[PDB]
Coordinates of C-alpha atoms in Angstrom, one line a residue:
Chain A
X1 CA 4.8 1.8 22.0
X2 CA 2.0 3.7 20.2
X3 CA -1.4 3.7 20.6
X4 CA -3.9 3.2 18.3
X5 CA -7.5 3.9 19.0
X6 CA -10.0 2.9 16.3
X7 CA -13.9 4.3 17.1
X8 CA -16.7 2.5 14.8
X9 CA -20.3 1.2 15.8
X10 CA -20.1 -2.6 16.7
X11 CA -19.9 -4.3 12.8
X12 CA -18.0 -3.8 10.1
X13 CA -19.2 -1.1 7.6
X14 CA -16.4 1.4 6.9
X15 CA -13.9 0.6 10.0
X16 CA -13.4 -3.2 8.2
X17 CA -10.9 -2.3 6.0
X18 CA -8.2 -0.6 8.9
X19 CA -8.7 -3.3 11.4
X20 CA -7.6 -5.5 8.5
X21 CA -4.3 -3.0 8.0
X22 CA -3.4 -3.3 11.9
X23 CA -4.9 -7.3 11.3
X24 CA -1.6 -7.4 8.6
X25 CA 0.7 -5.8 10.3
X26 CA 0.8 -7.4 13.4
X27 CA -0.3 -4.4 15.0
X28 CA -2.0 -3.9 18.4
X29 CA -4.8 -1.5 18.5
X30 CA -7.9 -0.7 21.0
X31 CA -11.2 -1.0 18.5
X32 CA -13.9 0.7 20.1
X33 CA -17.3 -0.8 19.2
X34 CA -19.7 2.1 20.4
X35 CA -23.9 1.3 20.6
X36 CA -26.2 3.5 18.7
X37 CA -27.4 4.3 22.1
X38 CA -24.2 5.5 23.7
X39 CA -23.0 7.4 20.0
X40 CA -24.4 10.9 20.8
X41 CA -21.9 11.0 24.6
X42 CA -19.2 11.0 22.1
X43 CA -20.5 12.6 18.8
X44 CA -19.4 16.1 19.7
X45 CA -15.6 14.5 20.6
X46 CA -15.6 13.7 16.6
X47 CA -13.4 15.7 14.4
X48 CA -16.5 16.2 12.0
X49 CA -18.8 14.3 14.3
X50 CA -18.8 11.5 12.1
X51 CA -18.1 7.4 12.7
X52 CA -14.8 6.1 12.1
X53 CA -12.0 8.0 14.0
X54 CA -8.4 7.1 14.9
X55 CA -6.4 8.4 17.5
X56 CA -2.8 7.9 17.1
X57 CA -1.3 8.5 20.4
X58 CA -4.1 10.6 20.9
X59 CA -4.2 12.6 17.9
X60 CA -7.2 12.0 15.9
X61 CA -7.9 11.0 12.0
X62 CA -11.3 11.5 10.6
X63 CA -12.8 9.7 7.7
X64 CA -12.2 5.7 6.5
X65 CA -10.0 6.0 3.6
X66 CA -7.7 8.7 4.6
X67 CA -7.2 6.4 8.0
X68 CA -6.4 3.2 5.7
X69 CA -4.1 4.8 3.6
X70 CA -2.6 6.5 6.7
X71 CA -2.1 3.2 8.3
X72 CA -1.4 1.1 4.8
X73 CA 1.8 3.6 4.1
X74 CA 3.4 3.8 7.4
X75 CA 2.8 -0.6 7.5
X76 CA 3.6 -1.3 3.9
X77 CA 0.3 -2.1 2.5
X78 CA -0.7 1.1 0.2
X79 CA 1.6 -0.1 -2.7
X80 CA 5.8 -1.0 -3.4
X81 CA 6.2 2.4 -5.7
X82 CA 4.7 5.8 -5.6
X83 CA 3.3 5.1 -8.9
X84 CA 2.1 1.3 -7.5
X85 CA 0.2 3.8 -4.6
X86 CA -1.8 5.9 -6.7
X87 CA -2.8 3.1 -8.8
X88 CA -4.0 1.3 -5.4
X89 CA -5.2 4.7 -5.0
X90 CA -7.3 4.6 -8.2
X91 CA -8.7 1.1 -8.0
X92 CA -10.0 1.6 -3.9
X93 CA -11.9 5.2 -5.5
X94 CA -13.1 3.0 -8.3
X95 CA -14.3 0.3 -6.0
X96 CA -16.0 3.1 -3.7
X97 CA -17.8 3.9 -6.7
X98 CA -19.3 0.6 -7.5
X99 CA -20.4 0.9 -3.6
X100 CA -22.7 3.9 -4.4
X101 CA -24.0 3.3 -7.7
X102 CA -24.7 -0.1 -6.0
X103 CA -26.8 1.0 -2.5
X104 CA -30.0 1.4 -3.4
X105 CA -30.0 -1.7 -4.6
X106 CA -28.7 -2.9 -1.5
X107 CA -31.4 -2.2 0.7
X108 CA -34.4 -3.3 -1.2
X109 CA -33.4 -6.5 0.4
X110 CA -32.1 -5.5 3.2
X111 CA -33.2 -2.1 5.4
X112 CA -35.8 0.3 3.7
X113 CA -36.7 0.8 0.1
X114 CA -40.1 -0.2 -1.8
X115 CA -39.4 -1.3 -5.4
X116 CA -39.3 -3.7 -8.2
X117 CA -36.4 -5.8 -6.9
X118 CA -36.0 -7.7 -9.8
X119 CA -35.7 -4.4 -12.3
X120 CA -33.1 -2.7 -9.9
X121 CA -30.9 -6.0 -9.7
X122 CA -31.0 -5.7 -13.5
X123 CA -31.5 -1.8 -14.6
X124 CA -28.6 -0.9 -11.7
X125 CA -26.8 -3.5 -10.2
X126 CA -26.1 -6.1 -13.1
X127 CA -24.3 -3.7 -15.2
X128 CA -22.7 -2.5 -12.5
X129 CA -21.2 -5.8 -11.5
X130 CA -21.0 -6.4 -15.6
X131 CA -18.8 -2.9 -15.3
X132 CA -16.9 -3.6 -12.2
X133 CA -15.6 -7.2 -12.4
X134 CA -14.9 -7.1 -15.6
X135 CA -12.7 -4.3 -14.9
X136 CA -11.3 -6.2 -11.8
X137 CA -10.7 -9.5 -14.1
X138 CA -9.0 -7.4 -16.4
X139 CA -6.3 -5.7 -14.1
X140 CA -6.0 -9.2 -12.2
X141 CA -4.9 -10.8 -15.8
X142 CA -2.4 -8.1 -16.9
X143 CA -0.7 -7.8 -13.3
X144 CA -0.5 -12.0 -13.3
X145 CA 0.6 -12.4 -9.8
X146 CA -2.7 -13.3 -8.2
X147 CA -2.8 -9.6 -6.8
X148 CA -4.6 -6.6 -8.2
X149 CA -1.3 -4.1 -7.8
X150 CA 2.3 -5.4 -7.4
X151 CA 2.6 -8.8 -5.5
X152 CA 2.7 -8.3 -1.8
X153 CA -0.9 -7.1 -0.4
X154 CA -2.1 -4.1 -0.5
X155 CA -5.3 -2.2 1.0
X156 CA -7.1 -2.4 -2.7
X157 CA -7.2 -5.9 -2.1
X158 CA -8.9 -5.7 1.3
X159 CA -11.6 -3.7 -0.5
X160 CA -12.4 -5.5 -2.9
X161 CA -12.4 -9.0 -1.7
X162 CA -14.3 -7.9 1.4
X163 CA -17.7 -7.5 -0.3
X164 CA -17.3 -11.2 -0.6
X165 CA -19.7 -10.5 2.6
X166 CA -22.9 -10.1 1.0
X167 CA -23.8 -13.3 0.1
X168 CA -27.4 -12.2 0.3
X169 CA -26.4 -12.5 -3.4
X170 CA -24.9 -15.9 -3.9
X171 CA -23.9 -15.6 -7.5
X172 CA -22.1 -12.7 -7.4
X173 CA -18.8 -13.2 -8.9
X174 CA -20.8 -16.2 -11.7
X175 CA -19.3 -15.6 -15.4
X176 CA -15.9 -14.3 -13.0
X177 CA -13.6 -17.0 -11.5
X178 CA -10.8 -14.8 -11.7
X179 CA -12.5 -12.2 -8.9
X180 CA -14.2 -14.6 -6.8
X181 CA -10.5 -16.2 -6.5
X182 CA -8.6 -13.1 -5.8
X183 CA -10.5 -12.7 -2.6
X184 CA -10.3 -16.3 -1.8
X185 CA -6.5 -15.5 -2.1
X186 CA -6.9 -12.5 -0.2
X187 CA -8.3 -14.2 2.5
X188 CA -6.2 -16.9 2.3
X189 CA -3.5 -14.6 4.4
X190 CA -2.7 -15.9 7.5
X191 CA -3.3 -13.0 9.4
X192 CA -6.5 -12.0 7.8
X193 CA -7.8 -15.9 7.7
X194 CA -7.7 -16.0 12.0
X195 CA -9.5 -12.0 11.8
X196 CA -12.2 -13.3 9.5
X197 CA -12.4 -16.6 11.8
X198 CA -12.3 -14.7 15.2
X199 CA -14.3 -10.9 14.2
X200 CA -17.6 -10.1 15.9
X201 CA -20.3 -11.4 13.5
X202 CA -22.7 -8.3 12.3
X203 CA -25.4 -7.5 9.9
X204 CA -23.8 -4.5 8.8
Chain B
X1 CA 10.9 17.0 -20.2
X2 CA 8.3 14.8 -18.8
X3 CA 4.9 14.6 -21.0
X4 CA 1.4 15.1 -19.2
X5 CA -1.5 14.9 -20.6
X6 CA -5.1 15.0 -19.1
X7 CA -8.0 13.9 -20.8
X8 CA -11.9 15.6 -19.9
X9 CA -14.8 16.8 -21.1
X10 CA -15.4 20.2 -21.8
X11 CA -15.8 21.5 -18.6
X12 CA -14.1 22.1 -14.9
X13 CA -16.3 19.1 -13.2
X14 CA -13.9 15.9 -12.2
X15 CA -10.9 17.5 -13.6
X16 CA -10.8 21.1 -12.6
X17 CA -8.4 20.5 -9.2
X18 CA -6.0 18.2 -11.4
X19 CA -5.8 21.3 -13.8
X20 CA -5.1 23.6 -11.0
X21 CA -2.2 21.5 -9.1
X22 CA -0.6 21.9 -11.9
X23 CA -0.9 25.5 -13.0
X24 CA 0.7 26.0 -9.1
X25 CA 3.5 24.0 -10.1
X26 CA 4.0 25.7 -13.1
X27 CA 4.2 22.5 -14.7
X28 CA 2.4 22.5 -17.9
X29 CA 0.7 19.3 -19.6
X30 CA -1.7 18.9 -22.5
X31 CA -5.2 20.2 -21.7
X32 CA -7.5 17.6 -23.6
X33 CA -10.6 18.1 -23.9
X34 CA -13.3 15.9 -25.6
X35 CA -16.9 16.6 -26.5
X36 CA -20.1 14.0 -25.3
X37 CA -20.0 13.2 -29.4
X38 CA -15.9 12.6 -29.6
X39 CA -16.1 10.1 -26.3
X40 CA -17.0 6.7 -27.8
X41 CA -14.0 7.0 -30.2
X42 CA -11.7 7.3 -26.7
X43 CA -13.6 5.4 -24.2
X44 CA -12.0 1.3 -24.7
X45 CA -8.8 3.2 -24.4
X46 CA -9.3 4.2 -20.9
X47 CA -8.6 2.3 -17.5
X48 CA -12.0 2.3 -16.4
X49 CA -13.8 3.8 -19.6
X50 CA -14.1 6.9 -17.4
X51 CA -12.9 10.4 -17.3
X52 CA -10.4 12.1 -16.5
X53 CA -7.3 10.1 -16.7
X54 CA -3.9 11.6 -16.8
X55 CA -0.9 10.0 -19.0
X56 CA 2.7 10.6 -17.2
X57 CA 4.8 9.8 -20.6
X58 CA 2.5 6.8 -22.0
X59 CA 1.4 5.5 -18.7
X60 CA -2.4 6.0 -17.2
X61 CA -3.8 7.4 -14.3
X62 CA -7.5 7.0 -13.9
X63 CA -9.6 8.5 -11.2
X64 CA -9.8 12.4 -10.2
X65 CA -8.8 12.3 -6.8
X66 CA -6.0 9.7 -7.4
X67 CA -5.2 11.5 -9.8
X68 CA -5.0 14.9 -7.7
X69 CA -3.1 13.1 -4.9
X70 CA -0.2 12.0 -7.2
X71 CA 0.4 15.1 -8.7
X72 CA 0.2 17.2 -5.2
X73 CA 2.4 14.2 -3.9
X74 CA 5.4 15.2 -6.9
X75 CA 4.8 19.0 -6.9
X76 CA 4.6 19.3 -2.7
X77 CA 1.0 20.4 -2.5
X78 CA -0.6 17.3 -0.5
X79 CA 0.6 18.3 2.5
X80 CA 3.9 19.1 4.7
X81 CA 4.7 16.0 7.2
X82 CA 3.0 12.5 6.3
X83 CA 0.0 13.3 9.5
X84 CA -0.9 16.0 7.2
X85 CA -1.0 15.0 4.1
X86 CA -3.6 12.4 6.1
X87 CA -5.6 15.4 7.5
X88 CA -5.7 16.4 4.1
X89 CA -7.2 13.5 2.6
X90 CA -9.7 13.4 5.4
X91 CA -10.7 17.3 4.9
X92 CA -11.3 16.7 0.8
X93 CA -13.0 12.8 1.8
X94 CA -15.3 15.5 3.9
X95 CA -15.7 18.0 0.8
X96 CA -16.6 15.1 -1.4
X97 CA -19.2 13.8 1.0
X98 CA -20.8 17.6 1.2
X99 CA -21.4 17.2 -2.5
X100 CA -22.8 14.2 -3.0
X101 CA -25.4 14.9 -0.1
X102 CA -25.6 18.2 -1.8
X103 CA -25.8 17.5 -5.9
X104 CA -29.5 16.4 -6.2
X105 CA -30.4 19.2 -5.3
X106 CA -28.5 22.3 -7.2
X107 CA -31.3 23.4 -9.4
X108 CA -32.6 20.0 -9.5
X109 CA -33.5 18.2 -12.7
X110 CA -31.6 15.1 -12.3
X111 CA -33.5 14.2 -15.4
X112 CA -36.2 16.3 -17.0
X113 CA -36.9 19.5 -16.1
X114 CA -39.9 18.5 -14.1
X115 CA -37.5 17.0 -10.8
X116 CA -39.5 18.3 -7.5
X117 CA -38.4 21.3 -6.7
X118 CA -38.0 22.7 -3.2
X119 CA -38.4 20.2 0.1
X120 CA -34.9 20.1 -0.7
X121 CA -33.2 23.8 -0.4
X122 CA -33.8 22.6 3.7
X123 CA -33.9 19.3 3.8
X124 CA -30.8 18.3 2.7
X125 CA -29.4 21.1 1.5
X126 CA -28.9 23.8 4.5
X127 CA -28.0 20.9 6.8
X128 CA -25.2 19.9 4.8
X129 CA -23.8 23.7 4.0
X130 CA -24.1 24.8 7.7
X131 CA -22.3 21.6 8.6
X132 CA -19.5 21.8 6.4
X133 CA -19.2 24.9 6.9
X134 CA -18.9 25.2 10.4
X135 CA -16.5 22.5 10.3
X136 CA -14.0 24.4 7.8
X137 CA -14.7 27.4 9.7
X138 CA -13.2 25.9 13.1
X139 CA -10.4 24.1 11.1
X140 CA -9.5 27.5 10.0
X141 CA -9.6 29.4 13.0
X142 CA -8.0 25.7 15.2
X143 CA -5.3 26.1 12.2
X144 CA -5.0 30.0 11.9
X145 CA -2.6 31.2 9.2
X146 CA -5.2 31.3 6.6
X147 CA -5.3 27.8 5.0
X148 CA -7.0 24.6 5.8
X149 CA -4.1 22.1 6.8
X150 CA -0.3 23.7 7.9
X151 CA 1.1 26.9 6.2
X152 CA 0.9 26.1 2.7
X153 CA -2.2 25.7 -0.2
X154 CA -2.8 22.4 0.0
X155 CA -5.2 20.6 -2.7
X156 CA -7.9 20.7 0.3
X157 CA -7.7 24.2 -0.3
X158 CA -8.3 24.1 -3.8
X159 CA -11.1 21.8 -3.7
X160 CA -13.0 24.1 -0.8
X161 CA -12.1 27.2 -2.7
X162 CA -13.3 26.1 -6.4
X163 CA -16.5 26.3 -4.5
X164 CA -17.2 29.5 -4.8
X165 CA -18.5 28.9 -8.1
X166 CA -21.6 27.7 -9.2
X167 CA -23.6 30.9 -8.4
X168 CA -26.6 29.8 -10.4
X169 CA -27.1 30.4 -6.4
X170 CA -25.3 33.4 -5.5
X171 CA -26.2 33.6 -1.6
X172 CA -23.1 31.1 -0.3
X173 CA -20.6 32.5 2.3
X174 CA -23.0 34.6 4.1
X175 CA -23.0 33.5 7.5
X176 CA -19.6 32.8 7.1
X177 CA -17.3 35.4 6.4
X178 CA -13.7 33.4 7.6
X179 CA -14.6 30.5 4.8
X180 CA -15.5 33.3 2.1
X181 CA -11.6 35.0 3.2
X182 CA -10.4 31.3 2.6
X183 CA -11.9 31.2 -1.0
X184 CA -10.2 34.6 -2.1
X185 CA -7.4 33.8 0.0
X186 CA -6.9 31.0 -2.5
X187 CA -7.9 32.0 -6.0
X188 CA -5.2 34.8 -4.4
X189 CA -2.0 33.3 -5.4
X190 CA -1.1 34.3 -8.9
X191 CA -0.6 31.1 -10.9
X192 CA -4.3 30.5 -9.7
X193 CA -5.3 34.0 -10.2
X194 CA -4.7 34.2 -13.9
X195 CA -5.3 30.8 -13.9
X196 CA -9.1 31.4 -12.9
X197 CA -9.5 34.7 -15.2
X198 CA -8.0 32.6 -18.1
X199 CA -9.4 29.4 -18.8
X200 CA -12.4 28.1 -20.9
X201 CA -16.2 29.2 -19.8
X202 CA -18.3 26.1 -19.3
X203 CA -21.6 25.5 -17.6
X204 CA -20.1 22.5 -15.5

């Protein structure tokens, strides 16, 4: 009855998350994968001519965690309590923050940068992971039901158990079996298993 | 009543908005503040071992922005209909991205005084301001009564508007007179008003 019209490049990067929201709710939505080639025909159409944008009966929604937590309240996904939302809240910002202190060591596999690999992994990655997941193992033990927030999914869950996807390091999650089974859990979900199964592979 | 109490450093930096939802309110809350030297005595007792976090009677809150969307949520600043209290995420995800293109920069010396010291002012700098601020200024006029999203101040507002500040650059706002009304227009209301003549002086 209403459209949904999600606009990302063709991969996964920082649309993911929201296709997983419609992916849990059963919910029917056009995901436009645009080319780097054909982006700048639509750039200026862009609320702040930035990549991803919804359009919700053709109003449109800038920016990817304002969209997920657009989509995860109205679906049921962004926490059970007002309190339970901003702690969901607190965890995706904290997550996000790992991200960033986390890129530059990202790429000196992967696209661009020219450094010591092996003293980046371990003067900015390791004890960010070391800060992260033992956070994560921590909120997963007091909140016992498998889940980070509550017991029912929520879109804290798809955030973290997503960059399960960068198994260009295999032993990420090594002294923590309580992460690396959260997002096995995660991903155990029906809905989500048949996404992951059936979603356009990308590098990014 | 109900017992608040934020916990920062001695400064505005992460905590500044959450301090000035509630001065709107006229909610009041105890204003913690700890030095670089107290911190290790608090730090095991935090969430994340980060500032700020807010207790609401006992309970903790980490992470600024979470933190500033619960508190707008209760006290009705975070938007009028559930579509804008979206747009307002989007507009302060948008303000958040301007700085952290923006903060190597700011007088540089993300270290040691010797940091190099001017590709940067155009580089990065100008590209960002005259994109973010063209974009404000056509939300603005798009929006036209004054504020960012709707009628009211919401914390989009605030976090635009506590821009004015760090004038150890004074030549912001210049080409663009309709985000310098915006900035006044908010530091306007009275709560804010006395709020901005009266608290502490810090460099950050």
């Amino acid at each position: 009855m209403v459209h949904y019209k999600l606009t990302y490049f063709n991969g996964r990067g920082a649309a993911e998350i929201i296709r997983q929201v419609f992916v849990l709710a059963g919910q029917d939505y056009e995901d436009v994968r645009l080319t780097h080639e054909e982006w700048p025909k639509h750039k200026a159409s862009m609320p702040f001519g930035q990549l991803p944008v919804l359009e919700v009966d053709g109003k449109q929604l800038p920016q990817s965690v304002a969209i997920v937590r657009y989509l995860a309240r109205k679906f049921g996904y962004a926490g059970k309590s007002a309190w339970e939302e901003a702690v969901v809240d607190s965890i995706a910002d904290q997550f996000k923050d790992f991200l960033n202190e986390v890129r530059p060591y990202f790429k000196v596999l992967l696209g661009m940068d020219q450094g010591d690999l092996k003293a980046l992994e371990k003067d900015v990655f390791e004890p960010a992971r070391q800060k992260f997941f033992t956070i994560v193992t921590k909120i997963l033990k007091e909140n016992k039901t498998g889940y980070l927030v509550g017991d029912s999914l929520t879109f804290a869950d798809l955030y973290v158990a997503e960059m399960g996807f960068t198994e260009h390091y295999p032993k990420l999650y090594d002294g923590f079996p309580e992460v690396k089974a959260h997002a096995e859990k995660v991903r155990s979900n029906p809905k989500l298993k048949k996404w992951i199964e059936t979603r356009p592979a990308s590098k990014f």
